[PDB]
Amino acid sequence: FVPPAWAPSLFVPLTGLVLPAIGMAWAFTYIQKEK
Amino acid sequence: MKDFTTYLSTAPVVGLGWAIFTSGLLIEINRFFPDPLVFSF
Amino acid sequence: QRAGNFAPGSEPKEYLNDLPGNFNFDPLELGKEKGTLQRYREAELIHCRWAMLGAAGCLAVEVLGLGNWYDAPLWAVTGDKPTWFGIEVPFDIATILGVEVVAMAVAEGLRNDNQDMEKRLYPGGAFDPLGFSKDPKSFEDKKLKELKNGRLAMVACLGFAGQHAATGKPILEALGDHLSSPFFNNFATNGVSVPGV
Amino acid sequence: ATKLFPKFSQGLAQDPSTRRIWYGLATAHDFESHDGMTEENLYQKIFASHFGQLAIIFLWTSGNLFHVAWQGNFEQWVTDPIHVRPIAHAIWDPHFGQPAVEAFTRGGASGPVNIATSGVYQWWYTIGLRSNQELYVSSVFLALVSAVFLFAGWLHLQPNFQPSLSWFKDAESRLNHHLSGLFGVSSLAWTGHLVHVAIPESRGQHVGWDNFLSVLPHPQGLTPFWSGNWAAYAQNPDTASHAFGTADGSGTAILTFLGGFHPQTQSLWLSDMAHHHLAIAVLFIVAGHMYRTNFGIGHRLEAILEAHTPPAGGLGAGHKGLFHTVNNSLHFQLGLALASVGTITSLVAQHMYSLPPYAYLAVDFTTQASLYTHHQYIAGFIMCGAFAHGAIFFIRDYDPEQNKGNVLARVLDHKEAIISHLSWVSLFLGFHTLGLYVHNDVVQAFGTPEKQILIEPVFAQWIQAAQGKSLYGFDLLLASSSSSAYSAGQSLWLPGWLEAINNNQNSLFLTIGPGDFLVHHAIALGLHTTTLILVKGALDARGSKLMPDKKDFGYSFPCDGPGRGGTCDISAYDAFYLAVFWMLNTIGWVTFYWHWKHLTLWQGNVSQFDESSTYLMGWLRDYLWLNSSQLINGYNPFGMNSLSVWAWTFLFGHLVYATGFMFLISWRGYWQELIETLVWAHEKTPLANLVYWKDKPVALSIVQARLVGLAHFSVGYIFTYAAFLIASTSGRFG
Amino acid sequence: DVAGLTPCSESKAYNKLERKELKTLEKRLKKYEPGSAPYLALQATKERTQNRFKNYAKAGLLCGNDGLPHLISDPGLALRFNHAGEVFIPTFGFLYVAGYIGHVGRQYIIKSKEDAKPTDKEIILDVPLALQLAFQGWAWPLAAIQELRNGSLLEKDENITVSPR
Amino acid sequence: KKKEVGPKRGSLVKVLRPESYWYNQVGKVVSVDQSGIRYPVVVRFENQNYAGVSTNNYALDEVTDPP
Amino acid sequence: AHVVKIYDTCIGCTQCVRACPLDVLEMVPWDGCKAAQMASSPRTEDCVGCKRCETACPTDFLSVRVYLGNESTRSLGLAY
Numbered sequence A: 001f002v003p004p005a006w007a008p009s010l011f012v013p014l015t016g017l018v019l020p021a022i023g024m025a026w027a028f029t030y031i032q033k034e035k
Numbered sequence B: 001m002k003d004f005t006t007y008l009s010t011a012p013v014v015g016l017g018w019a020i021f022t023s024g025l026l027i028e029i030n031r032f033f034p035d036p037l038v039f040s041f
Numbered sequence C: 001q002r003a004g005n006f007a008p009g010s011e012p013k014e015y016l017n018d019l020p021g022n023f024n025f026d027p028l029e030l031g032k033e034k035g036t037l038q039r040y041r042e043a044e045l046i047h048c049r050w051a052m053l054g055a056a057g058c059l060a061v062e063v064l065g066l067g068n069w070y071d072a073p074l075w076a077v078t079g080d081k082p083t084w085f086g087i088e089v090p091f092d093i094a095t096i097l098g099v100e101v102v103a104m105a106v107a108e109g110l111r112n113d114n115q116d117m118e119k120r121l122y123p124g125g126a127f128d129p130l131g132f133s134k135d136p137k138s139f140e141d142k143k144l145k146e147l148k149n150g151r152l153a154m155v156a157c158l159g160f161a162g163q164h165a166a167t168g169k170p171i172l173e174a175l176g177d178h179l180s181s182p183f184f185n186n187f188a189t190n191g192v193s194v195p196g197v
Numbered sequence D: 001a002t003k004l005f006p007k008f009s010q011g012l013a014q015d016p017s018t019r020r021i022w023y024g025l026a027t028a029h030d031f032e033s034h035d036g037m038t039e040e041n042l043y044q045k046i047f048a049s050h051f052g053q054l055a056i057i058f059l060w061t062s063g064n065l066f067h068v069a070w071q072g073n074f075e076q077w078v079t080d081p082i083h084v085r086p087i088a089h090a091i092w093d094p095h096f097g098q099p100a101v102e103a104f105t106r107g108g109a110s111g112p113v114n115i116a117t118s119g120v121y122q123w124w125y126t127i128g129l130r131s132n133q134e135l136y137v138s139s140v141f142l143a144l145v146s147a148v149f150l151f152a153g154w155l156h157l158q159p160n161f162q163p164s165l166s167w168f169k170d171a172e173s174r175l176n177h178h179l180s181g182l183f184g185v186s187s188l189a190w191t192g193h194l195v196h197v198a199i200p201e202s203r204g205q206h207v208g209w210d211n212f213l214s215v216l217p218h219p220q221g222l223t224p225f226w227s228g229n230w231a232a233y234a235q236n237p238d239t240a241s242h243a244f245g246t247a248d249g250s251g252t253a254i255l256t257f258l259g260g261f262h263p264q265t266q267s268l269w270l271s272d273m274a275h276h277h278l279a280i281a282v283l284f285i286v287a288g289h290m291y292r293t294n295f296g297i298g299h300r301l302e303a304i305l306e307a308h309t310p311p312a313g314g315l316g317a318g319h320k321g322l323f324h325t326v327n328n329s330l331h332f333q334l335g336l337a338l339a340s341v342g343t344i345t346s347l348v349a350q351h352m353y354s355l356p357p358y359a360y361l362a363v364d365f366t367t368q369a370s371l372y373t374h375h376q377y378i379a380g381f382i383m384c385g386a387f388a389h390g391a392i393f394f395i396r397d398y399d400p401e402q403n404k405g406n407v408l409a410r411v412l413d414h415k416e417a418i419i420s421h422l423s424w425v426s427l428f429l430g431f432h433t434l435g436l437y438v439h440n441d442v443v444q445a446f447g448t449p450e451k452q453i454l455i456e457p458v459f460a461q462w463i464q465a466a467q468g469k470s471l472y473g474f475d476l477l478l479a480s481s482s483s484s485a486y487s488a489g490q491s492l493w494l495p496g497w498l499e500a501i502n503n504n505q506n507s508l509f510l511t512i513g514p515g516d517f518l519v520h521h522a523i524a525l526g527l528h529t530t531t532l533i534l535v536k537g538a539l540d541a542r543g544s545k546l547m548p549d550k551k552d553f554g555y556s557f558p559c560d561g562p563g564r565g566g567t568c569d570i571s572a573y574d575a576f577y578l579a580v581f582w583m584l585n586t587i588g589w590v591t592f593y594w595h596w597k598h599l600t601l602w603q604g605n606v607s608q609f610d611e612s613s614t615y616l617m618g619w620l621r622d623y624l625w626l627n628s629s630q631l632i633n634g635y636n637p638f639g640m641n642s643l644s645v646w647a648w649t650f651l652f653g654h655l656v657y658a659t660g661f662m663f664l665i666s667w668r669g670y671w672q673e674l675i676e677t678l679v680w681a682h683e684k685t686p687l688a689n690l691v692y693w694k695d696k697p698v699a700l701s702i703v704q705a706r707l708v709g710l711a712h713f714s715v716g717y718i719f720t721y722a723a724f725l726i727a728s729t730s731g732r733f734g
Numbered sequence E: 001d002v003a004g005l006t007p008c009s010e011s012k013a014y015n016k017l018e019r020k021e022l023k024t025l026e027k028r029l030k031k032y033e034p035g036s037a038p039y040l041a042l043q044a045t046k047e048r049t050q051n052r053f054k055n056y057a058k059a060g061l062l063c064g065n066d067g068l069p070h071l072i073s074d075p076g077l078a079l080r081f082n083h084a085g086e087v088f089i090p091t092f093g094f095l096y097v098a099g100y101i102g103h104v105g106r107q108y109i110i111k112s113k114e115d116a117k118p119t120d121k122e123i124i125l126d127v128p129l130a131l132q133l134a135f136q137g138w139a140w141p142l143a144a145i146q147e148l149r150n151g152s153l154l155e156k157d158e159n160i161t162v163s164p165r
Numbered sequence F: 001k002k003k004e005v006g007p008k009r010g011s012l013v014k015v016l017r018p019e020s021y022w023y024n025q026v027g028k029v030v031s032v033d034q035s036g037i038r039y040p041v042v043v044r045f046e047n048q049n050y051a052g053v054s055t056n057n058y059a060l061d062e063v064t065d066p067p
Numbered sequence G: 001a002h003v004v005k006i007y008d009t010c011i012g013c014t015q016c017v018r019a020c021p022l023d024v025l026e027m028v029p030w031d032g033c034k035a036a037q038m039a040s041s042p043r044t045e046d047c048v049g050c051k052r053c054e055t056a057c058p059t060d061f062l063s064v065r066v067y068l069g070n071e072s073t074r075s076l077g078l079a080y
């Protein structure tokens, strides 16, 4: 139902730092993937 | 004379002559008919 | 075979030669194709007959003193008693609308399923009980007379429509107004037909 | 070489450069140019992509519902839809300072929140949503729908579930089903929901899924529908003194023709919209079974296309051969769909502000301005997309031997005449509009403004007088009772519509003056010029005199070199990319006109717009300078007000505009030589040459440079105008 | 009294604008001695302003809610309210002059092509020929419609340079 | 051989080649090659193209009379 | 790399080969032209697509055509 009060303190750093970082890591490994 | 006339017969010179002629005509018309907007004879 | 000219000395049409009611005409060169020509022929004949009947109704509703043709369907705005020469028929608007739609639909279906190009313009047979069309010359001159009276019928119907769109006076009142005061009262005195008179 | 990232392009895989990344993204969903691609595989990829876009749309609106319910004030806005502002989403930014946190606490919230301008509050209040739990369950249901659609796309992508080629090419059955089911029964179910929920909720009666199948929407109880007495539904409409939230002044009517606006909320009646959607559903269903399915009845598209040929060679072969042209070429269908949808959203933008369909939407000025601007910009973008994909159709899939002598072959035959006439009308409109504006500015500058030329827009005024506006006078229809238009419908919708159109407070047929006339002609100039550019790109797409073989070079190629005098920006893609600039200018003009006229209407100084829109000093000073005072004062050394974010994104938009200028003015040779010098610098340095690049750094392509400059230009344009519009409309209103 | 607008003579905002202009001209005039050239220049400007405001009135011009005169463009409506001289007559005059320009240019283009190096005649104009065609363009619509009648105004699609499809 | 494989030299011709710059244009025949090459008709044009040239070689089937 | 295509409208004037800055074209014997020469592209893998050969073509339209696509190290003009 209603999310807890610490949800803006967790999801915003997750989708602002951690999720873009792992996305760029996966994309960097995919760009330079060789045979 | 004819070489100078052909120089005056070039496109920029006759364009300049048209420019002074049209500008002077419109300016004298505006001066002797001060600020008209609607054709009323 | 040409019955006259809409302009004496105009350009003759090479395709509009073997035509009933040959009066040259066609300045816009419409119906040069033969199929379009015969389609225009049958359409003009149908419009002729319908304008014939419409002019008949408009004149007969007025010469008998029964009311305006434009005020004739005025019983159907909210529901009233219709009549035909004092017959006071009790027919609802839905019933007459449905039966008229059905009858006209099946009549148009039969006319479209005629499938005879000569008979589409002029069927004959059961539609000619008196049988005066057996003589070919009489048939030709009666075709010309029908076309002329039908053209007069459509221009008269257009005149009625325009007159009632301009002025509220009926047909007989307009005729009396033109007869009594033609110069002082005509189509130029309407003020709406010509923007500026 | 031959990396695995561009799996859809073997040639791009063997590219040892950074461009392989960029061309690996721009050509990502151009499946027609991919290696080893069949038509069936292309159709399956299109189906999967469509399901993906549907899932993304449903997830996005689910997120909007969830972020309105959680961290929002939907119930407080329901109680008082006039004073308190809607909340879009809460702000959690650790970079925020304490004065910035305190300044962003608006609408009675416990933290920093953003004032909602999308207008979903008014829409969800109009459709019957009242509680936050309803928004929560709607959001979770839409999330489930999005997950279902994504799984459906995955399953239809899987083997032994992929549709056949003839299944996709079955145009008649698709047309019949989408006309009858996607539009007919969808609208029927929507108006059923309207009747069941929204009218009782607007009349103070709660209708939910728990009490569903128990409360009768009409007290008669469906018996007039079976008895044919449909007029009994329009028996007791809501009174003028009716409250939207309560049952005061309520009635018993679900379908009526009460044309006009609700006096309390300045919006269209719910019963009127329900009747409209019911009639639309009936018209769609009765027209949704016209085409020839497997049954013996219906209409064949090809038969009607081939039979509709004018006689005597009016259009040559006529419309023959267009069925295979539409079916085989998907870009033709894409262009037709984008053009129709663009016209639809243009109509939506032009009809929302004049006829607000949502309760308490006209009072929310910033919401209406943002909605109109967004819809107009989307409309222009997909107008341009329709024309660009039409050019793509002309380049890629267009066989003149198939459609020989048809309408397409004819318009390709005399394309020079069409382009020349459009160029002439563009020159005519631009010359005279600029001459009039400069004349007015010079006349107003000389201190004698009465010498300016003010051509009265008599045509639009005559139309509005013919449609009920009695301000201009005249004696046309809907103004004189003797007219048949006045007599017809005198007791159906005329008394409400005349009252709505004779009021100057609402945006229904506002007063149009000479400045409105001039800006309308400017709009016409913009539309005609953008049309000229786009049809010149589309008609000269497959060939021209400078490049007869333009079809062999594809749709997006840079140039042919400096030969033949110079051949840069000769592709139809470049024509589209210039038309993007012209479309941006045109939508900027229409949005400037809308914003200034509506702002002067809301401030009550309509005379300021009437005497100030004539000359461009008024446009620059009374609109772009007077209304920007609150925007620029968002943050300053004195302090900060609530419009600090709008000032920041305004400067942000100006910055992205400048970066667009960077990527559009300078071209590839200078940056390539500079990149070579930087490559030498990285190669010949200690302590840094140990690392190396896997792909050689190269300058961006000329087409890529045009795309990047266009993207930066459009992003800066959109952000700048959105910032200015929202800051000007919300900084002084509410 | 069309379009819900009042005539300039009957309007109040027109007179208010004229009064404001006369007031600011008099304020500028009061800073100069009567025996100075700027005084005569400002007096001439005030006289021209008064003459223009008198000529704009009693000429059919009408203004709405701001004192700035408005122009009616629809023919017929301008004909029945004496507003044809606003735009209707000037548009016909401009069409006449534009047709004069087009006919003179067409005559110079055609008449300078049946000779060696027509580009030389294009770049160095034959001034007597140009003046002769200038004074022969007074009957441009007659010659234009006659060239349309004989078909020399338009070129056939077989001799016209055309782009590939 | 008999007569000549092409038109008379110095006579005006109209180019029927659609991809040429001088489509539906009048040019002058300079010389016609008789060896049997694909485009023997050398045509000189009064107006130059974008490349600045004024001569081109055309085949026998793409030249007609000036209409 | 790029695709260089030469048609039969070439007159064998050898201007395209002289204008080539990477030695892509060549002259082969021919019988379809007066000069008995025909342009060829046996080294199209070294062509960068500079379109210098198209500038030097004297014939109307183009007797030699360069089509870009599938850029490589040699085709991108890279010294690195």
Ligand code: CLA
Pocket: C036, C039, D307, D308, D309, D310, D311, D313, D314, D315
């Ligand atoms: C009563 C007489 C009559 C009239 C008035 C027409 C008139 C027409 N019929 Mg026709 N028709 C007739 C008899 C008639 N027909 C007959 C006897 C038959 C045999 C049964 C047909 C069978 C027939 C068929 C089967 C079809 C027509 C169609 C048409 C239309 C197109 C004709 C055409 O070639 O384009 C006119 C000629 C041109 C060369 C077109 C030029 C168009 C220009 C270039 C466009 C200019 C646009 C411009 C930018 C606009 C500026 C405005 C600005 C505000 C933007 C036209 C309205 C077609 C249709 O439905 O189209 C609506 C069609 O498919 N007719």
Ligand code: CLA
Pocket: D423, D424, D426, D427, D428, D429, D430, D431, D434, D525, D529, D532, D533, D578, D579, D581, D582
């Ligand atoms: C606000 C800036 C601006 C202006 C005024 C123009 C003006 C013009 N562009 Mg546009 N354009 C611009 C920016 C601008 N462009 C940008 C940024 C782009 C994106 C790259 C484009 C992309 C673009 C395309 C793709 C096309 C145009 C076209 C046109 C013409 C439209 C015809 C018209 O409206 O009548 C003319 C109106 C004008 C305002 C032109 C200016 C003329 C005034 C009156 C001055 C004339 C000289 C004056 C008498 C002074 C003389 C002395 C002086 C020379 C010293 C016109 C020449 C179209 C075209 O060529 O028409 C066929 C076209 O296809 N432009």
Ligand code: CLA
Pocket: D025, D026, D027, D028, D029, D030, D031, D334, D338, D381, D382, D384, D385, D386, D388, D389, D392, D555, D556, D573, D576, D711, D715
């Ligand atoms: C119904 C919608 C629709 C559909 C299905 C398509 C589908 C297609 N179009 Mg079309 N198009 C559309 C709408 C549509 N388009 C619209 C609205 C426009 C006008 C803008 C265009 C303009 C257009 C052009 C000009 C071209 C296509 C092309 C293509 C193809 C390439 C797509 C692909 O796989 O690459 C995927 C492509 C990308 C991922 C690139 C997208 C990059 C965007 C611009 C970045 C977003 C901007 C910005 C940075 C976002 C951040 C904002 C910031 C504030 C944070 C494909 C056939 C191309 C084609 O057929 O190739 C020859 C082509 O040349 N289209």
Ligand code: CLA
Pocket: D430, D433, D434, D437, D519, D522, D525, D584, D585, D586, D588, D589, D592, D616, D619, D620, D623, D624, D625, D628, D632, D653, D654, D657, D716, D717, D719, D720, D721, D722, D724
């Ligand atoms: C240093 C100068 C400078 C520059 C280069 C820019 C650059 C920009 N500003 Mg900014 N601006 C600046 C300083 C500057 N700014 C300052 C100091 C202020 C005061 C605070 C503003 C106030 C401001 C506002 C209020 C707006 C901008 C906008 C813009 C953008 C221009 C939009 C565009 O190209 O549309 C092309 C231009 C137009 C479409 C219209 C031009 C304006 C005219 C006068 C309106 C009248 C047009 C009307 C239809 C009649 C004309 C018809 C025609 C035929 C004659 C761009 C990001 C706008 C934006 O973000 O995008 C819309 C915007 O709304 N700026």
Ligand code: CLA
Pocket: D420, D421, D423, D424, D427, E101, E102, E103, E104, E105, E106, E108, E125, E130, E133, E134
């Ligand atoms: C007198 C020669 C002449 C003539 C008869 C035409 C005729 C035409 N042009 Mg062209 N034009 C000309 C010169 C001419 N043009 C020049 C010099 C230019 C370069 C500026 C153009 C640029 C041009 C464009 C860009 C367009 C036209 C278009 C048109 C058509 C619309 C009519 C019109 O007013 O367009 C408007 C024309 C102009 C605004 C150009 C006016 C240029 C100057 C002011 C006139 C020069 C007069 C000349 C000095 C007289 C010489 C007389 C001699 C004795 C010295 C029409 C076929 C349009 C079209 O395709 O319509 C289908 C179109 O889009 N023209």
Ligand SMILES: CC(/C=C/C=C(C)/C=C/[C@@]12O[C@]1(C)C[C@@H](O)CC2(C)C)=C\C=C\C=C(C)\C=C\C=C(C)\C=C\[C@@]12O[C@]1(C)C[C@@H](O)CC2(C)C
Pocket: C025, C026, C027, C028, C029, C030, C047, C048, C050, C051, C053, C054, C055, C056, C057, C058, C068, C069, C070, C071, C072, C073, C154, C155, C157, C158
């Ligand atoms: C059928 C018709 C009228 C039908 C009337 C009916 C049913 C009337 C019925 C009723 O009235 C009654 C009895 C009583 C009322 O209470 C009720 C109603 C119901 C109202 C009119 C046709 C009317 C037909 C008309 C007016 C035709 C006009 C044709 C024109 C102008 C032709 C133009 C061209 O000739 C040019 C100019 C140049 C050439 O190149 C080209 C062409 C095309 C040939």
Ligand code: SF4
Pocket: D558, D559, D560, D561, D562, D566, D567, D568, D569, D667, D702
């Ligand atoms: S786009 Fe660049 S390389 Fe091509 S013609 Fe233009 S300047 Fe030359």
